[PDB]
Amino acid sequence: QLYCDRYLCDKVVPGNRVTIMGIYSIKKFVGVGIRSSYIRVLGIQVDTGAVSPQEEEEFRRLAALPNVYEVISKSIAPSIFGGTDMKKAIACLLFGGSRKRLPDGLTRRGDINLLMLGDPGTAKSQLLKFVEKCSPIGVYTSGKGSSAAGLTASVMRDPSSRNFIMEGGAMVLADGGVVCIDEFDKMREDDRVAIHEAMEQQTISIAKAGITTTLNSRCSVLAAANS
Amino acid sequence: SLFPTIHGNDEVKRGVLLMLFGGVPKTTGEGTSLRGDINVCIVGDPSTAKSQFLKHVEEFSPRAVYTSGKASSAAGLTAAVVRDEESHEFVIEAGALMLADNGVCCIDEFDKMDVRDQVAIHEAMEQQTISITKAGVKATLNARTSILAAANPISGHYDRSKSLKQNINLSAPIMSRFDLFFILVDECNEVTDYAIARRIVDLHSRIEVYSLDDIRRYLLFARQFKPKISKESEDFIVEQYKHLRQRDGSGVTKSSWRITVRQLESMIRLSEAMARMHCCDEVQPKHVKEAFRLLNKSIIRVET
Amino acid sequence: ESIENLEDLKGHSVREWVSMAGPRLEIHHRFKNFLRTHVDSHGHNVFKERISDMCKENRESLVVNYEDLAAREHVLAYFLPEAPAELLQIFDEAALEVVLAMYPKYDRITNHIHVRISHLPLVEELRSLRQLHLNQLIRTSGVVTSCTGVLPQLSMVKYNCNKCNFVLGPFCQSQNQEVKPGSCPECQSAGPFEVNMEETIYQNYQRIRIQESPGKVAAGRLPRSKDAILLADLVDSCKPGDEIELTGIYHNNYDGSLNTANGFPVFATVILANHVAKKDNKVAVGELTDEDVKMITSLSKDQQIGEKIFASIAPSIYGHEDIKRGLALALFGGEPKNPGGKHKVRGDINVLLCGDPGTAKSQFLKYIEKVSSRAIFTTGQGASAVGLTAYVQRHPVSREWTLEAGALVLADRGVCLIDEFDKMNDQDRTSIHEAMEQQSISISKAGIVTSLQARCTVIAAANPIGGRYDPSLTFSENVDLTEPIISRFDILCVVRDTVDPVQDEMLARFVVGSHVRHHPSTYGVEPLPQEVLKKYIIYAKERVHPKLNQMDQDKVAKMYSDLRKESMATGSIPITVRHIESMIRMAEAHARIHLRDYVIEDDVNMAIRVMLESFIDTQKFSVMRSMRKTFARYLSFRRDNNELLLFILKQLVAEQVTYQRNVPEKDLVDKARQINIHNLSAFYDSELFRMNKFSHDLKRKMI
Numbered sequence A: 001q002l003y004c005d006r007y008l009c010d011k012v013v014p015g016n017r018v019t020i021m022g023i024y025s026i027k028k029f030v031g032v033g034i035r036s037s038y039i040r041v042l043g044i045q046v047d048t049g050a051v052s053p054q055e056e057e058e059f060r061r062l063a064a065l066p067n068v069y070e071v072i073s074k075s076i077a078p079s080i081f082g083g084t085d086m087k088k089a090i091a092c093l094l095f096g097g098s099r100k101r102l103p104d105g106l107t108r109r110g111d112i113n114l115l116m117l118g119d120p121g122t123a124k125s126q127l128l129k130f131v132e133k134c135s136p137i138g139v140y141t142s143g144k145g146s147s148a149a150g151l152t153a154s155v156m157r158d159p160s161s162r163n164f165i166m167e168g169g170a171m172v173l174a175d176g177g178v179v180c181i182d183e184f185d186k187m188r189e190d191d192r193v194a195i196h197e198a199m200e201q202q203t204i205s206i207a208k209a210g211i212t213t214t215l216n217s218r219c220s221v222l223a224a225a226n227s
Numbered sequence B: 001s002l003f004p005t006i007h008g009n010d011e012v013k014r015g016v017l018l019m020l021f022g023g024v025p026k027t028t029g030e031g032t033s034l035r036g037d038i039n040v041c042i043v044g045d046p047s048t049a050k051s052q053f054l055k056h057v058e059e060f061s062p063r064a065v066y067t068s069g070k071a072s073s074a075a076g077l078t079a080a081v082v083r084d085e086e087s088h089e090f091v092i093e094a095g096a097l098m099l100a101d102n103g104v105c106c107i108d109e110f111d112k113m114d115v116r117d118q119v120a121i122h123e124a125m126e127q128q129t130i131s132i133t134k135a136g137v138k139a140t141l142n143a144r145t146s147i148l149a150a151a152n153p154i155s156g157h158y159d160r161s162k163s164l165k166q167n168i169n170l171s172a173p174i175m176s177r178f179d180l181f182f183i184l185v186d187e188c189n190e191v192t193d194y195a196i197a198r199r200i201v202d203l204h205s206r207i208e209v210y211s212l213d214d215i216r217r218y219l220l221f222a223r224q225f226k227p228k229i230s231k232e233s234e235d236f237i238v239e240q241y242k243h244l245r246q247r248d249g250s251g252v253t254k255s256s257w258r259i260t261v262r263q264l265e266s267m268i269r270l271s272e273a274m275a276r277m278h279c280c281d282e283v284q285p286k287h288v289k290e291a292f293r294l295l296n297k298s299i300i301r302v303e304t
Numbered sequence C: 001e002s003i004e005n006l007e008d009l010k011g012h013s014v015r016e017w018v019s020m021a022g023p024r025l026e027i028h029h030r031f032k033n034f035l036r037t038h039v040d041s042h043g044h045n046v047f048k049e050r051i052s053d054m055c056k057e058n059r060e061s062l063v064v065n066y067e068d069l070a071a072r073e074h075v076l077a078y079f080l081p082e083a084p085a086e087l088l089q090i091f092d093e094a095a096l097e098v099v100l101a102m103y104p105k106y107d108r109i110t111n112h113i114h115v116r117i118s119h120l121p122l123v124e125e126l127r128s129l130r131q132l133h134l135n136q137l138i139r140t141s142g143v144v145t146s147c148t149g150v151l152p153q154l155s156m157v158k159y160n161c162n163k164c165n166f167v168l169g170p171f172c173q174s175q176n177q178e179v180k181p182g183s184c185p186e187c188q189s190a191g192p193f194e195v196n197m198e199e200t201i202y203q204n205y206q207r208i209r210i211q212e213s214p215g216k217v218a219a220g221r222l223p224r225s226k227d228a229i230l231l232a233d234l235v236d237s238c239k240p241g242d243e244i245e246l247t248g249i250y251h252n253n254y255d256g257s258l259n260t261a262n263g264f265p266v267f268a269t270v271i272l273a274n275h276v277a278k279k280d281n282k283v284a285v286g287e288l289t290d291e292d293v294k295m296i297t298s299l300s301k302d303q304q305i306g307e308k309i310f311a312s313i314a315p316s317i318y319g320h321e322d323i324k325r326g327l328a329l330a331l332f333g334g335e336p337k338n339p340g341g342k343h344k345v346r347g348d349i350n351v352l353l354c355g356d357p358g359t360a361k362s363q364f365l366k367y368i369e370k371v372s373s374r375a376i377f378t379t380g381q382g383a384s385a386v387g388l389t390a391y392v393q394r395h396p397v398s399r400e401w402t403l404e405a406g407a408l409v410l411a412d413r414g415v416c417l418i419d420e421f422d423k424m425n426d427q428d429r430t431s432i433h434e435a436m437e438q439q440s441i442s443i444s445k446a447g448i449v450t451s452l453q454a455r456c457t458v459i460a461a462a463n464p465i466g467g468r469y470d471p472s473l474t475f476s477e478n479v480d481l482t483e484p485i486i487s488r489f490d491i492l493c494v495v496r497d498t499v500d501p502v503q504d505e506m507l508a509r510f511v512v513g514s515h516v517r518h519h520p521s522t523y524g525v526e527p528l529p530q531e532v533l534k535k536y537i538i539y540a541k542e543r544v545h546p547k548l549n550q551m552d553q554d555k556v557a558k559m560y561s562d563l564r565k566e567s568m569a570t571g572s573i574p575i576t577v578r579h580i581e582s583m584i585r586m587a588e589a590h591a592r593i594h595l596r597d598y599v600i601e602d603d604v605n606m607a608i609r610v611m612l613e614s615f616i617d618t619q620k621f622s623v624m625r626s627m628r629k630t631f632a633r634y635l636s637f638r639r640d641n642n643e644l645l646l647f648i649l650k651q652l653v654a655e656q657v658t659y660q661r662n663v664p665e666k667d668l669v670d671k672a673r674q675i676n677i678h679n680l681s682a683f684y685d686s687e688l689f690r691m692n693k694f695s696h697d698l699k700r701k702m703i
C-alpha cells in the first residue's frame, strides 16, 4: 500500500511501472500486537510524457531524415530475422492513424488492428512480446488465459461499501495503446465476441447490476494465432 | 468354501483367490513403487455368473467396495472436484477406488465408464495413485487397491470365433493393466442347466470346508508373509516369460494382446500369491508353475 | 560466581528449574561448549563451518540437529522438549556470543540470532495432537493452505504518555494479549496511550494454516488443520501448497469466541514455529557442506561422469538409454538468457515420451517426481486448463477476486510431469503453450490483468493412436498431437515393445533381479547413489552457469538446413528456431552435467546426436536406413578420432627414437593440445595404441 500526497496525486496511473521513494510506516488506524504497514510516498519516478527540447530536436531530426521508415522497421524486433513486411505492419500499428470526429458527431478509429495467423515457431509471440515492451501503453494477454469480463470490463461488488463498481479489463487498461492477444485462436467464441465493440467503435458499452456506462477503449489489437 | 454357490469355473475361483492373497508390494532404491496388487477381469454374457463372483468377493472380504462402471455420484471410480457452499470452494469427493484403498474394488459393468474415470483408471491401476490438479485442489491421492472387473462383450454373446480383444471394447492400455482375464460363456448344456437350477434351489432350501470367519482370519494372517524369490524360481520365471514372448512373437503380426513386461510382473505377483496362500518363506518353482499355468491359459483364451 | 552443577536432578519443575539463575548459566555454558567442540564423524568442527556459512550470507539464524545435540549434551536434549521457550532463549544467547567470538563485528549485521532445531524425533500426526502435547516442542507435517502477508508485530513497545512527552519504558509484547502500561510513572494519567512508532521495535509476523496432506490419511474424510505463527527470519519460509515439515511449540490461550461457539471453556491453540523444512526439497544449495561440494567437484573430474549420470537415472529400469539421456539433459537443463535485454528465450528443456503400453513411461515420470525438487505430477483428465495454469477465485475471507497459482506456476523452477498426455482434453492441453515457450502465464480475468512466471520444464508421457505404436507410420502420422504442441517439445522419444528374445531375456532377468533385490526383507558403468545425484543436480543448477562463445556455427546451420529438407518429405516437425535452440539448450545442459562454465565441442556433438537420433526415431521403419546414412555420414556422428592420435604418437616416437639412436607422454599431449584433438583419454582407452605396444602411466609419464 502507498500513500500519495498533494502533487503526487494522479502523477501515476494503473499499469505504470514506477520506483517509489517513501517512508515505510504503520497505518496507525489474525493476532493481537499486529499493525498494518504502508509506504508514505514522497517521490515518484516513472521507470517506463513531457519531453525536453533536446529530445524534441532529436525526434524532429528522426522524422526529417529520409529513411526513417526503414530505420523504424529495422529497429522493431532486431533479434528477429526476416519478416520485414510484418515489422513494417507493426510500425504502422504502433504509430497508428488519426482519429477523426465528423460534423454529425460520428467518430472514426485511427487505431490499426493486425492479425498474425500462420505456422508455429515463427516469432509471432516474440513480436507480440516486443510490441508490449515498445508501445507507450502496452498490455500482453494470452487468449486462452482471458475472459470476456477480463478483456473488456468487470462489474464486481465493492466489499467495503456493498455497491457494484467497475473494473477495467485489458482493453481498458490498454486505452491509448496496444493489446497483444497471444494464442488468439484458443479463446472461446463468446469471449472473442466481447471485443467486437471495442475493436471497431473503440467503446465498451455496459449495462449490468444497475450501473450503465460507455467506457473508452481507444486501443489497437495485435493478435497472433495458429492454423 | 469361498464360492459354494458357483458351479464349475474352478480356474476363475483359483484366480480370484490368488487376487485375495495378492503379491508383495515393493519400493525401488530410487523411491519408486512396484505394484503388488493383481487385477482380474471377468468377461461374460449377462446371463452368466460374472456378477456372482463379485458379490461373493464383496460379501466375504472386509473393507471391499462394490460399484457399477457408471457412477452413482459426481465422483466415480476416481475422485471428482466439487464446490461446497459452506465456503463456495472446491474440494475433492472421493471415488470407489479410494474408498477401496488397501482393499478390493469390485467393478461391475466395467465396459461402460465415463471418459474421466476411464482415463484416470490408467494411473490408478498401475501407479496406485490418482493425481488431481484442478482449480483450488492439487492432490496425489492413494488407491492401493486390487480391482475385480466384470465386463459385458459387444452384442451380449461372447463370440468364440472373434478374439477377446474383438469381443470387448477395452483399449489395449487398459487390457495390459489386468493380471488375469477370464471368460464365462453361457453354454446350452442340459446337464449344466439342471446343475445350476439344483444348486440355486437346494442352497435356497438349505438356508434356515471352512467358515468365512476362518477364511478371513487365515487370509489376514497369510497376508503378513512376504515371500522371497528363490534362485531356481527366478530362472523358472525368466525362462517361462521368454517362452511366452517368443510364442507371442509367432503371431505378433496379427491382431493380438502383444504381451508386455506387465505380464512378467503379473507372473511374479501370482507366484508370490501362491506362496502367500501356503505361507511359504519364498517362492518355489511349483508356485511359478501354477502361476504360469493360469497366466498362459489366460493368454490362449484371450487370443483364441 | 554461580557454581557449575549436575543438571538433571532437582525438586522444581523443568520450566522453573531452567529459569533459575544457576542452572540457566550452566545450560548456557554447556550449549556454548557444544557449539565450540562438536565434530562430525570425520572430525570436522561442524558449527564453525555452519557459523561461517551463516555469517557470509548474513542469514542470522543457526540450524542445530537434535540427533547430535542428544549425542553431545544429554541434559540439554532432555530439557528441550519439556521447556522449549526458555531453553531456546538460552541457546539463542549462547549462540550469539559464540558468533560474536568467531566474527566480532557481526553485531553490526544483527543484534540477535535464533537457534532453529531440526530432526526432532518426537514427530506427531497433525490430528493426533492432544492436551498432552501442550507447551512442548513437537514436529508435524502438512500442506500449507493459507498464509497472511508478512506483517510487522510489536515486540518491544514504548508508549508516549496520553497528556505529555514522556515515553513509558519497553513492554515485551506477547502472542496472547496486547500488553499495556496502565498509568504513566512520571504522572499517573491512565487508559489510552500512543505507541512511539519510531522507537518501538517490531518483528516480522506471518500466520499460516496447515492441514493434513491430501494423500496421507484423508481417504474421503475431511482433513484436520492447525494454525502456526512464523516470526523474524522464518517468514517467507513457505507458501500455499508447500508440503512443509514444521517444528514448533504447541501453545494454547484463552479464546472467548471459541468459548461461546462451543459453550465450554475451550482454549484455542497455535504452533509457535521453530523450524520449517520441506518434504520435497530434501536437499538445498543453502544446506550443502564443503565436503559435499568437494566430492561433487571430484566426481566431475571423471571422464565417465556423463555415462555415470545417465546410468544413474531410474536405475531400476533396464535399457532405454536414450530416454535416460534425454531425461538427464532435461533434469539438468540449459541456461536462460536475454540478449540485448529485450528478447527472452527459455533455458528449460521439454521432453515427450511416446510409446506402447508396458514400457515404464509413467514409471520414468514417477522417478523424476521423486528425484527432482519442486516437482509435481498430474494425469490426463485429472488435469484442467485452469488448474494447470492459474485460477481466479473469491478470496475466502475478503470475498474479492484473487489470482492463485496453478500447476505450472507452482513448478515455476521445477518440473511439471503430465502422464498419459494424449488423453487430455484439447482445451486442457492447449493451455500450456505460453508456459511451454514464453514461460509466462498471462491472465485477463475478473479485473486481474497480469502475467505470472512459469519457467517450468514439462516432461510428458503418451500413447499413440490405438495404444500400440506401428512402425509403418511416422510419429506425426500416429501421435494425434498437432504441430504447435509437438514443436514445443525439445526432445521427442519413441519406445516400442518389439520382440527380440535375447533382449527379452536380458530385460526379464533384470526385472526379476529388481524384484528380488528390492524385497522388503545396458549400464556397464555403475550409477551414482541417488542422494549423491540429488546433491549433484542441485549444485549444478545453481553454482554453474554455462556460457556459449563458439559452437561451430556453420556445422549447426548446415545440419539444421538439411534436417529441414529431409523433414519436409516425412512426418516430424523441426519448426525453424525451436530445434536450433533445443540443440543450444542441450549443449548447455551437457556442460552443466560436466560442471563446465563454458560449452565445448563435445557438448555440441552430444546435442546434435540427441536431436538427430530422435528425428531418425520418428521416421517410418523402411525410411530409417536411408535417413540414418544421410545424417550419420556427413552430420557429425563423431564416435571417435583415434587414428590422428595414433599417428601423432608414432611420429613423435619415430622422431624420438631417431634422435636417441643418432617425457614422451608430455610430448604426446603437447601436440594433442596444439591440434584440436584435446580429449586424449579416448586414445588411451582404445586398442589402437595398445596393439602398437604403447601404454601409459600417470606417475612415470612414459609411453
Ligand SMILES: Nc1ncnc2c1ncn2[C@@H]1O[C@H](COP(=O)(O)OP(=O)(O)NP(=O)(O)O)[C@@H](O)[C@H]1O
Binding pocket: A079, A080, A081, A082, A119, A120, A121, A122, A123, A124, A125, A126, A127, A224, A225, A226, C344, C345, C346, C433, C437, C484, C576, C577, C578, C581
Ligand atoms: N525469424 C526468427 N528470428 C529469430 N528467432 C526466431 C525466428 N522465428 C522463430 N524464432 C524463435 O523461435 C522461438 C519461438 O518463437 P515464437 O515467438 O513462439 O513464434 P510463434 O510463431 O509465436 N510460436 P507459436 O505460439 O507456436 O505460434 C523463439 O525463441 C523465437 O525467438
Ligand SMILES: Nc1ncnc2c1ncn2[C@@H]1O[C@H](COP(=O)(O)OP(=O)(O)NP(=O)(O)O)[C@@H](O)[C@H]1O
Binding pocket: B034, B035, B122, B126, B127, B173, B176, B261, B262, B265, C316, C317, C318, C319, C355, C356, C357, C358, C359, C360, C361, C362, C363, C364, C462, C463, C507, C511
Ligand atoms: N525396461 C523396464 N525395466 C523395468 N521395469 C519395466 C520396464 N519396462 C516396463 N517396466 C515395468 O512395467 C510397469 C508399467 O510401467 P508404466 O510406467 O506404467 O508403463 P507405461 O509406459 O506407462 N505403459 P502405459 O501407461 O500403458 O503407457 C512398471 O512396473 C515398470 O517397472
Ligand SMILES: [Mg+2]
Binding pocket: A124, A125, A182, A183, A224, C433
Ligand atoms: Mg504463441
Ligand SMILES: [Mg+2]
Binding pocket: C361, C362, C363, C419, C420, C461
Ligand atoms: Mg503410463
Ligand SMILES: [Zn+2]
Binding pocket: C161, C162, C163, C164, C165, C166, C184, C186, C187, C189
Ligand atoms: Zn503525562
